[PDB]
Paper text:
In Striga, the receptors responsible for SL-induced seed germination are evolutionarily derived from a KARRIKIN INSENSITIVE 2 (KAI2) receptor and have arisen through gene duplication and new functionalization replacing the karrikin ligand by SLs. Among the several Striga SL receptors, S. hermonthica HYPO-SENSITIVE TO LIGHT (ShHTLs), [name] is the most sensitive to SLs.
Previously, the structure of [name], co-crystallized with Triton X-100, showed that the hydrophobic tail of the ligand, which includes the phenoxy group, interacts with several amino acids in the receptor cavity. These interactions provide the basis for the tight binding of Triton X-100 and its blocking/inhibition activity, together with those that take place with the polyethylene repeats at the outer rim of the [name] binding pocket. Building upon this work, we co-crystallized [name] with the triazole urea derivative KK007, after incubating them together, and soaked the obtained crystal in 1 mM Triton X-100 solution. Thus, we determined a crystal structure that showed KK007and Triton X-100 bound to [name], where KK007 was covalently linked to the catalytic Ser95. This structure showed that Triton X-100 left enough space in the active site to accommodate small covalent ligands targeting Ser95, and, hence, suggested that the combination of both moieties might generate efficient and Striga-specific inhibitors. Therefore, we attached the alkyl benzene moiety, which corresponds to the hydrophobic tail of Triton X-100 without the methyl groups, to the triazole urea scaffold, which led to the two compounds KK023-N1 and KK023-N2. Structure analysis revealed that [name] possesses a large ligand-binding pocket among other SL receptors in parasitic and nonparasitic plants.
Residue numbers in the entry: 3 to 270
The structure:
């Protein structure tokens, strides 16, 4: 079963299903503080994307997961297996973009997308600022495999905007280093090379874009870029948070914002 392969869990009850999709380096446990505020009002489906440390390495196809589309098509299959349609999809960066692509092919499966720290592309061009320069990225990725742990540990405090000794950091590193090393490196290279800009004008489901005010992975202007380039309606809310995973590191601020966007539609 694809649901079993993705450790799908179902909780709550209701006519509307919320689907929670964790981002890079985490698993569905990242949602543990949000779930209590959903369980009374919604059915909730949680899953781990393929290659998370909780998943079977034998199911990781290095060809399919070298681009984001494979994750999009897996998500469709998960939703179909559990008879989910018109869901409220809540995702962190990588996952929210995979759902956006999925929604082009199956808009019937999505009522809206709630996106925490999304970006369609990290690498700068002459006309687009994603935060990272190609030639520096090239140097860093050349020695990624032998340096995965040291580079990840070295950058995580700025990535998360948390101290190395903090509880949020310990939680992130626990799941990050649970991935098998070759799988982690494949997913990392996939993320660093993504360019989903060609898809944006064909996304038409409503998108709720939730960003930290200071996120080393997401220049603040990327949210407005998404609003201007998505094909349907969207709302952009920059939060008084720092870090790329504000749902993990600053839940006291982030959870009420996520809940508002789950509960309140921007279309009729």
């Amino acid at each position: 079963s694809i649901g079993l392969a993705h450790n799908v869990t179902i909780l709550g009850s209701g006519e509307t299903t919320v689907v929670l999709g964790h981002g890079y380096g985490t698993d569905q446990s990242v949602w543990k503080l949000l779930v209590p505020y959903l369980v009374d009002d919604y059915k909730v489906l949680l899953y781990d994307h393929m290659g998370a440390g909780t998943t079977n390495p034998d199911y990781f196809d290095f060809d399919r997961y070298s681009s984001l589309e494979g994750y999009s098509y897996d998500l469709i299959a998960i939703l179909e297996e559990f008879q989910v349609s018109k869901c409220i999809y809540v995702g962190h960066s990588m996952s929210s973009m995979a759902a956006a692509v999925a929604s082009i092919f199956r808009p019937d499966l999505f009522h809206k997308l709630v996106m925490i720290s999304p970006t369609p592309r990290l690498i700068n061009t002459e006309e687009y600022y994603g935060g990272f320069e190609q030639k520096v990225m090239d140097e860093t990725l050349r020695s990624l495999d032998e340096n995965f742990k040291s580079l990840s540990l070295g950058t995580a405090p700025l990535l998360l905007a948390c101290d190395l000794e903090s509880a949020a950091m310990q939680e992130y590193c626990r799941t990050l280093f649970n991935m098998r090393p070759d799988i982690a490196c494949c997913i990392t290279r996939m993320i660093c090379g993504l360019d989903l800009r060609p898809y944006l004008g064909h996304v038409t489901v409503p998108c709720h874009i939730i960003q930290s005010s200071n996120d080393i992975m997401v220049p603040v202007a990327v949210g407005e870029y998404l609003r201007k380039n998505l094909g349907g309606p969207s709302v952009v809310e920059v939060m008084p948070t720092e870090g790329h995973l504000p749902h993990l590191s600053m839940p006291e601020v982030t959870i009420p914002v996520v809940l508002r966007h789950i509960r309140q539609d921007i279309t009729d």
